Amino acid sequence: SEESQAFQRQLTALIGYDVTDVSNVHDDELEFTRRGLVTPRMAEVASRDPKLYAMHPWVTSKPLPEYLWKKIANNCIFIVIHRSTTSQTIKVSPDDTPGAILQSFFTKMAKQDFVLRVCGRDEYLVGETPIKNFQWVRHCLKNGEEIHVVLDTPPDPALDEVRKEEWCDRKFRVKIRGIDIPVLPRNTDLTVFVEANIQHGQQVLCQRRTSPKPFTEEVLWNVWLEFSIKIKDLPKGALLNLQIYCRLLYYVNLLLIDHRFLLRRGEYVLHMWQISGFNADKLTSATNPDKENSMSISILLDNHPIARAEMPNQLRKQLEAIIATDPLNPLTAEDKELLWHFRYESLKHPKAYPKLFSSVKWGQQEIVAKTYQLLARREVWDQSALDVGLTMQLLDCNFSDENVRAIAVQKLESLEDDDVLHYLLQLVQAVKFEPYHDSALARFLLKRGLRNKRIGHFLFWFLRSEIAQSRHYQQRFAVILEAYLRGCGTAMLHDFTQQVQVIEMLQKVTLDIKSLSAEKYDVSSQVISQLKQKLENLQNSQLPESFRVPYDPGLKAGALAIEKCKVMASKKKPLWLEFKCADPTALSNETIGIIFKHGDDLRQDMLILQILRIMESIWETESLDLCLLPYGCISTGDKIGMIEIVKDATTIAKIQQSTVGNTGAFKDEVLNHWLKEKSPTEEKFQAAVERFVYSCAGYCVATFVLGIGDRHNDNIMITETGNLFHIDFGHERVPFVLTPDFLFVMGTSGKKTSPHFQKFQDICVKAYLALRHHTNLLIILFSMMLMTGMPQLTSKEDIEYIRDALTVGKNEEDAKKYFLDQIEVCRDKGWTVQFNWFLHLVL
Numbered sequence: 001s002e003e004s005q006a007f008q009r010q011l012t013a014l015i016g017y018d019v020t021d022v023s024n025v026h027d028d029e030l031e032f033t034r035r036g037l038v039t040p041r042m043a044e045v046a047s048r049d050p051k052l053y054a055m056h057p058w059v060t061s062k063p064l065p066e067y068l069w070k071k072i073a074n075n076c077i078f079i080v081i082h083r084s085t086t087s088q089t090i091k092v093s094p095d096d097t098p099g100a101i102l103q104s105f106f107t108k109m110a111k112q113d114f115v116l117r118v119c120g121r122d123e124y125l126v127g128e129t130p131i132k133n134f135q136w137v138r139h140c141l142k143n144g145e146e147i148h149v150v151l152d153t154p155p156d157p158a159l160d161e162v163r164k165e166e167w168c169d170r171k172f173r174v175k176i177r178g179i180d181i182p183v184l185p186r187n188t189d190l191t192v193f194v195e196a197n198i199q200h201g202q203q204v205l206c207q208r209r210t211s212p213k214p215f216t217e218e219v220l221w222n223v224w225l226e227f228s229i230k231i232k233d234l235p236k237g238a239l240l241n242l243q244i245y246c247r248l249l250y251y252v253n254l255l256l257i258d259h260r261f262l263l264r265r266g267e268y269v270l271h272m273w274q275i276s277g278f279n280a281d282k283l284t285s286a287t288n289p290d291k292e293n294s295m296s297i298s299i300l301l302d303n304h305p306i307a308r309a310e311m312p313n314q315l316r317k318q319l320e321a322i323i324a325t326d327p328l329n330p331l332t333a334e335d336k337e338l339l340w341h342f343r344y345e346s347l348k349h350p351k352a353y354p355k356l357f358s359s360v361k362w363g364q365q366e367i368v369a370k371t372y373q374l375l376a377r378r379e380v381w382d383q384s385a386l387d388v389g390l391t392m393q394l395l396d397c398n399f400s401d402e403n404v405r406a407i408a409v410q411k412l413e414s415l416e417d418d419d420v421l422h423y424l425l426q427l428v429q430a431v432k433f434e435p436y437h438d439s440a441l442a443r444f445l446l447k448r449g450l451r452n453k454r455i456g457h458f459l460f461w462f463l464r465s466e467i468a469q470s471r472h473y474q475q476r477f478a479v480i481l482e483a484y485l486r487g488c489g490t491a492m493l494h495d496f497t498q499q500v501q502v503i504e505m506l507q508k509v510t511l512d513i514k515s516l517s518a519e520k521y522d523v524s525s526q527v528i529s530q531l532k533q534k535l536e537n538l539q540n541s542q543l544p545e546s547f548r549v550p551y552d553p554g555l556k557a558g559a560l561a562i563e564k565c566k567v568m569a570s571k572k573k574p575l576w577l578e579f580k581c582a583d584p585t586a587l588s589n590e591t592i593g594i595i596f597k598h599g600d601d602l603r604q605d606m607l608i609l610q611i612l613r614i615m616e617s618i619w620e621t622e623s624l625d626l627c628l629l630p631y632g633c634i635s636t637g638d639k640i641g642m643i644e645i646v647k648d649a650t651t652i653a654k655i656q657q658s659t660v661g662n663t664g665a666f667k668d669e670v671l672n673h674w675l676k677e678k679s680p681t682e683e684k685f686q687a688a689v690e691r692f693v694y695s696c697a698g699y700c701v702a703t704f705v706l707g708i709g710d711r712h713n714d715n716i717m718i719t720e721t722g723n724l725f726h727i728d729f730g731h732e733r734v735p736f737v738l739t740p741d742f743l744f745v746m747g748t749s750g751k752k753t754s755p756h757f758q759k760f761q762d763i764c765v766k767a768y769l770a771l772r773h774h775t776n777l778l779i780i781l782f783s784m785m786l787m788t789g790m791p792q793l794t795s796k797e798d799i800e801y802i803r804d805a806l807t808v809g810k811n812e813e814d815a816k817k818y819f820l821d822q823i824e825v826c827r828d829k830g831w832t833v834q835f836n837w838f839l840h841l842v843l
């Protein structure tokens, strides 16, 4: 039918990639995956609750933190209801349901159903949850704000209507025909060979090379390469990894067993990727779509189907020591055999699972069989509490077995939406380690996306971020995105369509302004002449009357406040943009600000930010509030995207450059004077200093742990109310920024104590050693972030940074000492590093 074609064209535009294109395919796995995803999509669409889906309550079952209870001194929360500029303050208990709040409101007033939607937002307080367990309500207690809510008819679930969809015992060998590239690289005669690896879980099962031969535009081997492995022994998910050295310069992969469990057969011309000059990109089954410029390799496959007793005391100790070791500790051959031979004892310990499944000889069919027989008695696994870190380890690059990876996904099923949103970006990224496009993990995300509008919204942008930037995975991620968009509802398709149209227009402007003033330090009259003009043009006949803010979907932006818009003064040339709020019932006349920037990898900013939210949650469990300010941030395209504007905030550099701004000179007292001038009462001034002690502690700890502590002042900011925050993560050493200006806010001076600095040390140590309780989780997030987020990274050195930073293997005293020593390094150093930046620019 024809309105099936139109709808596909809608989807192509939303996706930014055409999932029906079959130009860059060696087989039909992508189509098979489109059709396969119809079933789980339709299931979750059919079975989701219409009312709660439309209203997407944002809710948690975690206990209300100690520090928020303190903020309720009386067991009564205050809630201002509105009708149409009439309002009443209803007293309410924290265990009151929204249903029960409405019985007490209606009785108060009068003496056909409605819902309490938050003022100024598409956000609702509904369902059988205490109000204290709604996230909006926790956001208002933490910030000392009044819960303002308005009364109206529930939104029509009809609006969310989903359109009806219409739909052998021989050694393995490959023949290397040759390699072809139309133009030669670096252009001196070197030698070149082809390495062929059989790989499973980044484990090399077997390896053969061709001879060296003169690297010309066209090189021919015509050699059968015989491997040590039998055909019947190739495991599902095994890759033929073909690489070219002279040293690693080109790579490509071919799944040996296909999505129908069939051995791969025939002629292949595979167009390869080129290394830049270990990482998720190296694992991709996708070929280079640029058929014209790229290096290609020709191969021939012509090889069909296929689908106790008591352990001694000291060996168990040896086993228990191996199990209790961090995820980045190399297993020895002895360690592996021990794990394997006493696999049944190892299965009683859910934490052994990663090491145990990585002690498996995946290139032996009988062993694989025994492993499946092993996982069939999963009772201890199935009954253990969800340990998100342990589970993420099974979804990383070290596991290619479908059955291992699925018991990890099974575990995730018990995460509330709350917890999914925390892990969503890393779970999306973990799709890069799937052997096949259709996976249990792909389907989990699809299912949870379709179940909750909030998760769907972020799932869309996280998927779309990769589809627009990585050639290596765009095909895979586009098929997943299309499956989502096909079940999300007509209201969300429209909302997404508006959003994409807004940033397509705005990125356009962003690049055009860059070219007008090159690097040169100042933003001219003539440059803030055009920005206004381009905005006026866009608004009056192109740019939507209203769009959802991608980084904060509850908020709806309206018309540009053109006066407040400007080009920012940096060497890259970002748009600072302010919008009116579309919602007539907002409390404030205040603007939604958004920065558009081209220049750096905003995906890296996304990654760090997410780990930061996770860190605030670990700290929440142990009743700590460190007041991070993880700003909203979405990568939309190649080195380009949006960033939330934090209000009443300025950079540390800027505060320093105001009374003076000479050449690298800094002043100890301005930060403290600045806070004093921003606080109209001594009350708010001491509340400022206190938030500075906490937020500064949070960022020092967090930031040390992730190896990003050494920043120029340019990329550290503060709000008027004392909240320090780091920015631009995508952009003699020091473990973190605790400069003498920060110390003087803390009442301290050049090697000496004070009460706020005693406190600062106190909070750092509590904060540090609380992350250390979650060491394995952090090690896996860091490790995955490096692999899916950066350029080429060190399958030891770069990744092992975190273990030494988390001071793995030490008692709580050595760890407290160690961090306290780090504080002292920033003290000795003072201004050294900040000054050096300026010294360097002449270098």
Ligand SMILES: Cn1nc(-c2ccc3ccccc3c2)c2c(N)ncnc21
Pocket: 595, 597, 605, 631, 643, 644, 645, 646, 647, 649, 650, 651, 727, 728, 729, 730
């Ligand atoms: C002066 N300034 N600079 C930024 C800013 C913050 C975060 C960024 C993250 C990546 C790239 C540029 C960025 C730019 C910024 C911001 N996000 N909110 C309010 N004021 C701000």
